[PDB]
Design an enzyme around this catalytic site. Structure first.
Site, short mmCIF file in Angstrom:
data_model
loop_
_atom_site.label_atom_id
_atom_site.label_comp_id
_atom_site.label_asym_id
_atom_site.label_seq_id
_atom_site.Cartn_x
_atom_site.Cartn_y
_atom_site.Cartn_z
N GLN E 11 77.70 -12.49 -17.60
CA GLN E 11 77.36 -12.52 -19.02
C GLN E 11 76.48 -11.33 -19.40
OE1 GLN E 11 76.24 -16.06 -21.92
NE2 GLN E 11 74.44 -15.49 -20.71
N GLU E 64 83.00 -17.87 -16.32
CA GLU E 64 82.88 -18.77 -17.45
C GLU E 64 83.59 -18.18 -18.65
OE1 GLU E 64 78.92 -18.22 -19.37
OE2 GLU E 64 78.22 -17.97 -17.31
N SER E 133 74.10 -7.95 -14.21
CA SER E 133 72.72 -8.39 -14.10
C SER E 133 72.50 -9.02 -12.73
CB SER E 133 72.37 -9.38 -15.21
OG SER E 133 72.81 -10.69 -14.88
N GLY E 137 74.32 -15.66 -10.97
CA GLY E 137 75.31 -16.10 -10.02
C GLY E 137 76.51 -15.18 -9.92
N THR E 138 77.29 -15.10 -11.00
CA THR E 138 78.51 -14.29 -10.97
C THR E 138 78.18 -12.80 -11.03
OG1 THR E 138 80.60 -13.84 -12.10
CG2 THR E 138 78.74 -14.54 -13.46
N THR E 172 64.07 -15.80 -16.94
CA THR E 172 64.86 -16.88 -17.50
C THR E 172 65.15 -17.97 -16.46
OG1 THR E 172 65.91 -15.38 -19.08
CG2 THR E 172 67.02 -17.47 -18.63
N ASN E 199 64.04 -6.03 -18.42
CA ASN E 199 63.87 -6.34 -19.84
C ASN E 199 62.46 -6.15 -20.36
OD1 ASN E 199 66.56 -7.01 -20.05
ND2 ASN E 199 66.23 -9.23 -19.95
N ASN E 221 70.58 -4.25 -26.10
CA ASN E 221 71.86 -3.72 -25.65
C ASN E 221 72.21 -2.42 -26.38
OD1 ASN E 221 71.99 -6.20 -24.20
ND2 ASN E 221 72.93 -7.17 -26.00
N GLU E 247 78.16 16.02 -10.22
CA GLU E 247 76.93 16.81 -10.15
C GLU E 247 75.71 15.96 -10.50
OE1 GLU E 247 77.67 20.01 -12.80
OE2 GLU E 247 79.07 21.04 -11.47
N1 LIG Z 1 69.28 -6.91 -20.92
C1 LIG Z 1 69.95 -8.06 -20.97
N2 LIG Z 1 69.89 -8.94 -19.91
C2 LIG Z 1 70.57 -10.11 -19.95
C3 LIG Z 1 71.32 -10.44 -21.07
N3 LIG Z 1 71.88 -11.65 -20.84
C4 LIG Z 1 71.50 -12.09 -19.62
N4 LIG Z 1 70.68 -11.15 -19.06
C5 LIG Z 1 70.05 -11.22 -17.73
O1 LIG Z 1 70.80 -12.08 -16.89
C6 LIG Z 1 69.93 -12.88 -16.11
C7 LIG Z 1 70.56 -14.24 -15.81
O2 LIG Z 1 71.95 -14.12 -15.57
P1 LIG Z 1 72.99 -14.36 -16.77
O3 LIG Z 1 73.41 -13.04 -17.38
O4 LIG Z 1 72.35 -15.25 -17.81
O5 LIG Z 1 74.25 -15.11 -16.12
P2 LIG Z 1 75.33 -14.31 -15.23
O6 LIG Z 1 74.86 -12.90 -14.96
O7 LIG Z 1 76.65 -14.31 -15.95
O8 LIG Z 1 75.45 -15.15 -13.87
P3 LIG Z 1 75.82 -16.71 -13.91
O9 LIG Z 1 74.53 -17.50 -13.83
O10 LIG Z 1 76.69 -17.07 -12.73
O11 LIG Z 1 76.54 -17.04 -15.20
C8 LIG Z 1 68.66 -13.02 -16.92
O12 LIG Z 1 67.53 -12.99 -16.09
C9 LIG Z 1 68.66 -11.81 -17.83
O13 LIG Z 1 67.70 -10.88 -17.39
C10 LIG Z 1 71.38 -9.57 -22.14
O14 LIG Z 1 72.05 -9.86 -23.13
N5 LIG Z 1 70.69 -8.38 -22.09
MG LIG Z 2 76.81 -16.45 -17.25
#
Ligand SMILES: Nc1nc2c(ncn2[C@@H]2O[C@H](COP(=O)(O)OP(=O)(O)OP(=O)(O)O)[C@@H](O)[C@H]2O)c(=O)[nH]1
Ligand SMILES: [Mg+2]
Ligand SMILES: Nc1nc2c(ncn2[C@@H]2O[C@H](COP(=O)(O)OP(=O)(O)O)[C@@H](O)[C@H]2O)c(=O)[nH]1
Ligand SMILES: Nc1nc2c(ncn2[C@@H]2O[C@H](COP(=O)(O)OP(=O)(O)O)[C@@H](O)[C@H]2O)c(=O)[nH]1
Lengths: 50, 430, 32, 65, 432, 103, 430
Positions: E11, E64, E133, E137-138, E172, E199, E221, E247
């Site tokens: 995500q 998801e 990120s 998880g994913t 989070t 962040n 973003n 480079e």
């Molecule tokens: N900069 C930024 N970071 C994000 C954003 N959305 C989620 N994150 C980061 O993602 C971390 C948690 O993972 P998620 O992105 O919510 O979920 P995921 O990466 O899809 O992994 P899953 O839990 O398996 O769904 C948080 O600690 C955030 O720092 C975003 O819109 N902008």
């Molecule tokens: Mg997610």
């Protein structure tokens, strides 16, 4: 020891080689053509008179 | 007869070559379309040196462009005078050397250089009389530093008795834009000293200083530096392309400037240089020209000419003047600056006269000199190189393409002993 | 090219040589 | 001389030469550029423009004091 | 002729990817439906369909469907390829073992087939850009798997990862220190360059410069997208000093293990307080070195600098850069390592940055983006190491991982790798 | 802007002014000045068309003198070469008109 | 031939030099664009003494304008006759001296003097035969007296055989503008006596006095004061630029009026001076000219000549007149004022005649003289110096730039020593 017929050649303006002989002929070509004005035997005169 | 071919590599070398062709075409009065629109016969008398002509009477330069990327070639073909160059001569790769000497000399340059060497063989065999080669390249960049020196090696291997020119801009510690400059500079100079007959050294910071001090223009750009370099280039071969009181070809310059085979690194400069606001106040005279010539700030290199003694000096005079006045000026400056001239050689200044001045100028002089002051450039580059090499920083890219630290150590040795034997003659006395 | 210069025995380069002295004289008068 | 020109073409009917003093760049600023007798140490102008020429020429002798 | 492929996973990666593709369309004038109303700069990011529309060169991957279905129902439905949006059914749910051993195995086959179908179309492929990120998880599970498969399938192609690591004190999730280290082991030997994009730093940037007291994720973003555009700007725009992707690692990586770097951007101002300052090149380059302006929550004054690759886009003059850079070297608070005398790789571009309509940023003639490698980055690896040791000492949250097919002892290798990495930074930093 | 072409510029230079006003001459022109830059006379002077009453005076000042009738003919053919509605002719164009004539 | 170069420094020096070139140019018939427009032949024969020829027919003075603050040169260039100056010769500082001698002689003038020394060397070598130097500066100012006297030493050690004169405006206690005048005035004269071949003092107070009792104009300004000095300056070298009955170059002046090497401070005066309303009434004759020039009120400085004993005097006559009427009138005053001429140098009058009078005047006489009356001028400055030095007032400014109280003590001792040896000749009898 300057040598002629050096593969491809430029015009006679450049001094690469055989320019003097080429220039002398070309200069004399119109001098004969000048003589063609001296004596009224130009083909152009014949057609212009025509 | 006695024509020379021009080959350029790298972005900097390509810009230098483009502006050199700019200047030469303007001097000879050739329409960018390749058609001669000149006015005097002297413009066409010696055009064979730099130009060939094709069917229809239009002329084309004998220039070959090499690079590993198409970015600069597409930009230089789309500008003015971009259609003179014969299209097949555009030979280039698709990936790029990536600022790496190893990539531009061992992996990608080696496999691609076959075609460019074939076309340069074609041009050399086509020309009536090859007089020498001239190359524009930068010691800092990847593709230049590698392919230029590899092609120098190949050209020297196939042509032993010809003359090699290399207008090379060396990196400088003040104006630096790359982090791995010293490695490439050392690796380039190691091969360059072995093969090249004449090497022209130019500094970016010296050009900036000249533009800021003499011309006093507030906003220098890369175009202006390229234009200055191009004027300096044309000043060398003006004497060969035009008549004069004392004719001097490239071969005569080498003999009168090189005492020993390994001492072939020269610094160059151009006169006159005047600002727009002060151009009508100056008086164009030989003494003024000589003063500006021996002015230290006029040299287009960062070396300090008064930090060392001149071995030999040479001045090529463009325009029509009197021989006795220049002769006496050379004697006077020789007597006035005896401390800055080596004492075991008498009359160590060469003078020539060419009766055709550059367009828009009544007089001009091109100066080239061999002095020990150039050692400062190699010392400052060596200091950075050894500092980075002691920690083996950024080394696995070079060692990842067949190279080893032994080659770097050998290159350092060839640079160091060169400096030592170059400075030995500074303190050697008769 | 209208090679008129070889009809009479005059060198080809005369066409612009005399052009510039007239053009040089004009510039000097304008300067004053 | 250039092609088509005799060495004696630049002469008059009397045989004397025709002299254009300020035409030659070399002699300008020298005694032959003006009408002064040689070794005259006065300053001669260098550049040439269409009022200094009349004063520098000194065609006639200076007025006695 | 020069192309790059973008991989979006998780995500966090997806929600920043769609913001990036919004910015890229505006730069080239491509309408959201894909058509262009009225040279081939777009070729690095888009590919012509033969008649009309241009399609992006990116593949969306997720387990998801919530975020993907948002894109498919959004106004950008007609832009992306319908079968380039890969989605699953079951979420990874903050579990690394689920994304790397249970569910991620059945999806990685589909993505590699599409990437293969995208590389053959390209002829001058430059590299990969992957967004993920770490603290998820994913994001960490699939991201590790794709990196492993790509490194053997393609090999020498340079891979660039724009990872978002967890913030130092705010977060989070609660178990993200676990799966952050697990993915850290994978990316160390499989990605060429990694960038720190936490962040907390971006929150401070919005508060001080733009004065945004309550920003949402979209503001974060948009700022990230501007950095990516600047990095690629030399590829698709003519400039005085062009810089290629290849480079970077030749000029930014001293040693193969040391390839973690943090970024900065300037200027970042609103359109009403921009009237009161001239935005000269001398001052925009000074704002780049402000420690508060680092995109990663790290204080560079605590360590040396190794190298700096900083780029100007706009109408900057080359002489101005040298004057500005010379002042930096004369400054004493900014000190470099002793074995790197020159450390600036500078590029100049003729393409001023664009601004999205209704965006927070203002349009200006000059902007500078930096990628810098410094020894100060050792702190962030330590602070996550401290957090992990606190929880693992009593085996909290472990039964969720061992029950998904991963060995209990895998945590030992993951922890010992970070300690090895710390030993490298402290070893290289000492003088000679 | 890097060069200030919207500042209206000052008539007198302050000898220490560090900014550009768009009138700076590139080094391409400086290395090869446009012929007469050393005499203070710039060649965008010949192109300004001039009437006959001053063209004649200029040319007798130079040293070329023609009788009336001849001068009106050379002026009219110079105007024909110019092919402009106004009777005034450029001095340079009148010069090439003379160059065509004299034979 | 035997041309001289001009250097003006400080605010006062530039102001003095601004009107000097205006006077000379009008005399030679040169418009402010440098285009010669003279009416007599003689105005062109000796143009090269002060002017240099440039291509295009214009003329440019060989003057160097130097200062540490760019404001003054910004104003003089925009004024009339400001276009004659070469834009290259404009050399300036960046911060200013603030009337601090140590700052303008040790800390900031040291690194700036490299540029000014290079340009003056260029002018000196350009001329065929150098004659001497003339300097305009202020001894009461920081940059004027600091950088001014520093250039005196540097030039002298490079040309030990050429002559060199200075025009120094010493501070006057009556017309006081600064509180630290005694300090830097004492220091500057300490170097000036050792190096300068000739020095001519000036007081603003006397210039105010002369304007009131002779010219009687109600509203004088700096322009009128500078005009009086400029007229006196042109008088000294007038016979050098024009033929005369008895030519007397600058070396002629030096030998006759310098009995001993360290007695080279003179008293200057210009005649005739007439108010606007009384121009028609007065008869301009040699008896009138000699009477006015010897008037103590006509003296250009606050020194009182009748309080001392004249060593030597010199008069330069401009215009056409019988040479005899100059001769016996010099003897006429000499025998009538036998108590006012030194007895052991009998016949101590220099007379020279130049045939070209100033424009607008039929006759004129410039008088420069060496007298014992200058002791009071030096005595009063030393009185102020030691009064403010015993309490060490304002001393921390000079001691903060590497200068110690040993230097201050030595300079005042030399000035005290100079006064003592200069007045014992007054009491000397044969
Ligand atoms: N900069 C930024 N970071 C994000 C954003 N959305 C989620 N994150 C980061 O993602 C971390 C948690 O993972 P998620 O992105 O919510 O979920 P995921 O990466 O899809 O992994 P899953 O839990 O398996 O769904 C948080 O600690 C955030 O720092 C975003 O819109 N902008
Ligand atoms: Mg997610
Ligand atoms: N004179 C001049 N120098 C240039 C120009 N462009 C780049 N350079 C110099 O070349 C160096 C970089 O070389 P580079 O372009 O990487 O060489 P390449 O890799 O062989 O193309 C820099 O230090 C610049 O100073 C130019 O247009 N003119
Ligand atoms: N004759 C004359 N004297 C001046 C002029 N301007 C200033 N002065 C004198 O110069 C003195 C001040 O010197 P100053 O300019 O401070 O010297 P600096 O600090 O070295 O530049 C004053 O006492 C004035 O009498 C001027 O225009 N004409």
């Amino acid at each position: 020891m300057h040598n002629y017929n050096v593969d491809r050649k430029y015009q006679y303006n450049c001094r690469i080689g055989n320019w003097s002989e080429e220039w002398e002929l070309d200069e004399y070509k119109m001098k004969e053509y000048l003589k063609n004005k001296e004596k009224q035997k130009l083909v152009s005169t014949d057609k212009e008179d025509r | 007869m006695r024509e020379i071919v021009h080959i350029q590599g790298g972005q900097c070398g390509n810009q230098i070559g483009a502006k050199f062709w700019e200047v030469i075409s303007d001097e000879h009065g050739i329409d960018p379309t390749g058609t001669y629109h000149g006015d005097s016969d002297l413009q066409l008398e010696r055009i064979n040196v730099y130009y060939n002509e094709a069917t229809g009477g239009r002329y084309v330069p004998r220039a070959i462009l090499m690079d590993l990327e198409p970015g600069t070639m597409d930009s230089v073909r789309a500008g003015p005078f971009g259609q003179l160059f014969r299209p097949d001569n555009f030979v280039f790769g698709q990936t790029g050397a990536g600022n790496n000497w190893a990539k531009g000399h061992y992996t990608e340059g080696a496999e691609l250089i076959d075609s460019v060497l074939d076309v340069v063989r074609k041009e050399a065999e086509g020309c009536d009389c090859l007089q020498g080669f001239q190359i524009t390249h930068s010691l800092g960049g990847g593709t230049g530093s590698g392919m230029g020196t590899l092609l120098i090696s190949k050209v020297r291997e196939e042509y032993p008795d010809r003359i090699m020119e290399t207008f090379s801009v060396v990196p400088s510690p003040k104006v630096s834009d790359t982090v791995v400059e010293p490695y490439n500079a050392t690796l380039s100079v190691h091969q360059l000293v072995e093969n090249a007959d004449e090497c022209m050294v130019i500094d970016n910071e010296a050009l900036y200083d000249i533009c800021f001090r003499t011309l006093k223009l507030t906003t220098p750009t890369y175009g202006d530096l390229n234009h200055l370099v191009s004027a300096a280039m044309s000043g060398v071969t003006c004497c060969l392309r035009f008549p004069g009181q004392l004719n001097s070809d490239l071969r005569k310059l080498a003999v009168n400037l090189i005492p020993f085979p390994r001492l072939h690194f020269f610094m160059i400069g151009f006169a006159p240089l005047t600002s727009r606001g002060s151009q009508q106040y100056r008086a164009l005279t030989v003494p003024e020209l000589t003063q500006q010539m021996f002015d230290a700030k006029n040299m287009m290199c960062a070396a300090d000419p008064r930090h060392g003694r001149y071995l030999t000096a040479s001045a090529l005079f463009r325009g029509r003047m009197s021989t006795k006045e220049v002769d006496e000026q050379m004697l006077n400056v020789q007597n006035k600056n005896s401390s800055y001239f080596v004492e075991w050689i008498p009359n160590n200044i060469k003078s020539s006269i060419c009766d055709i001045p550059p367009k828009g100028l009544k007089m001009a002089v091109t100066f080239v000199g061999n002095s020990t002051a150039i050692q400062e450039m190699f010392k400052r580059v060596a200091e950075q190189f050894t500092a980075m090499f002691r920690r083996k920083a950024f080394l696995h890219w070079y060692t990842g393409e067949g190279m080893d630290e032994m080659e770097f150590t050998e290159a350092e040795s060839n640079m160091n002993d060169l400096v030592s034997e170059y400075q030995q003659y500074q303190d050697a006395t008769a | 090219t209208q090679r008129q210069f070889i009809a009479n025995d005059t060198y080809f380069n005369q066409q612009h040589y005399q052009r510039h002295e007239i053009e040089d004289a004009l510039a000097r008068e304008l300067q004053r | 001389g250039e092609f088509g020109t005799k060495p004696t073409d630049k002469l008059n009917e009397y045989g004397n030469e025709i002299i254009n003093k300020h035409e030659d760049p070399l002699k300008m600023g020298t005694t032959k550029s003006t009408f002064h007798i040689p070794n005259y140490t006065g300053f001669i102008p260098a550049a040439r423009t269409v009022k200094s020429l009349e004063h520098a020429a000194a065609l006639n002798s200076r007025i006695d004091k | 002729m020069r192309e790059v492929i973008s991989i979006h996973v998780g995500q966090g990666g997806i929600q920043v990817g769609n913001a990036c593709w919004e910015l890229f369309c505006l730069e080239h004038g491509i309408q959201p439906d894909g058509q262009m109303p009225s040279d081939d700069a777009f070729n690095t990011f888009f590919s012509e369909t033969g008649a009309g529309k241009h399609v992006p060169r990116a593949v969306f991957l997720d387990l998801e469907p919530t975020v993907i279905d948002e894109v498919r129902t959004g106004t950008y439905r007609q832009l992306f390829h319908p079968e380039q949006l890969i989605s699953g059914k079951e979420d990874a749910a903050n579990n690394f073992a689920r994304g790397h051993y249970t569910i991620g195995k059945e999806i990685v086959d589909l993505c590699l087939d599409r990437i293969r179908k995208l590389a053959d179309n390209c002829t001058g492929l430059q590299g990969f850009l992957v967004f993920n990120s770490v603290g998820g998880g994913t994001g960490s599970g699939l991201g590790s798997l794709l990196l492993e498969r790509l490194s053997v399938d393609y090999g020498k192609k340079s891979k660039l990862g724009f990872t978002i690591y967890p913030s130092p004190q705010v977060s989070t999730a609660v178990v993200e220190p676990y799966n952050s280290i697990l993915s850290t082991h994978s990316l160390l030997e499989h990605t060429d360059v990694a960038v720190m994009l936490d962040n907390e730093a971006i929150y401070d940037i919005c508060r001080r410069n733009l004065d945004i007291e309550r920003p949402t994720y979209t503001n974060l973003n948009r700022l990230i997208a501007q950095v990516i555009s600047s990095l690629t700007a030399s590829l698709r725009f003519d400039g005085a000093l062009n810089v290629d992707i290849t480079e970077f690692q030749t000029n930014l990586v001293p040693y193969p293990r040391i390839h973690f770097m943090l970024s900065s951007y300037a200027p970042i101002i609103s359109a009403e307080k921009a009237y009161h300052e001239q935005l000269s090149v001398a001052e925009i380059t000074n704002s780049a070195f402000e420690p508060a302006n680092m995109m990663a929550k790290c204080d560079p004054r605590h360590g040396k600098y190794m190298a700096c690759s900083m780029m100007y886009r706009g109408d900057v003059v080359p002489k101005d850069v040298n004057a500005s850079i010379a002042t930096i070297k004369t400054k004493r608070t900014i000190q470099f390592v002793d074995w790197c005398p020159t450390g600036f790789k500078v590029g100049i571009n003729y393409q001023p940055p664009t601004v999205v309509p209704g965006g927070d940023l203002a349009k200006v003639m000059r902007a500078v983006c930096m990628i810098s490698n410094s020894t100060a980055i050792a702190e962030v690896f330590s602070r996550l190491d401290h957090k992990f040791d606190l929880m693992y000492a009593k085996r909290a949250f472990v039964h969720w991982y061992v029950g998904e097919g991963m060995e209990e002892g895998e945590f030992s290798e993951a922890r010992e790798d970070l300690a090895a990495l710390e030993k490298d930074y402290e070893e290289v930093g000492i003088e000679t | 802007p890097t060069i200030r072409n919207d500042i209206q510029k000052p008539l007198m230079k302050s000898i220490a002014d560090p900014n550009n006003y768009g009138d700076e001459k590139p080094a391409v022109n400086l290395l090869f000045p446009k012929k007469y830059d050393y005499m203070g006379v710039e060649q965008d002077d010949f192109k300004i068309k001039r009437h006959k009453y001053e063209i004649k005076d200029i040319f007798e000042k130079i040293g070329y003198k023609y009788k009336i009738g001849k001068f009106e003919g050379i002026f009219k053919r110079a105007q024909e070469i110019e092919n402009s509605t106004d009777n005034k002719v450029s001095c340079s164009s009148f010069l090439q008109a003379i160059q065509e004539m004299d034979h």
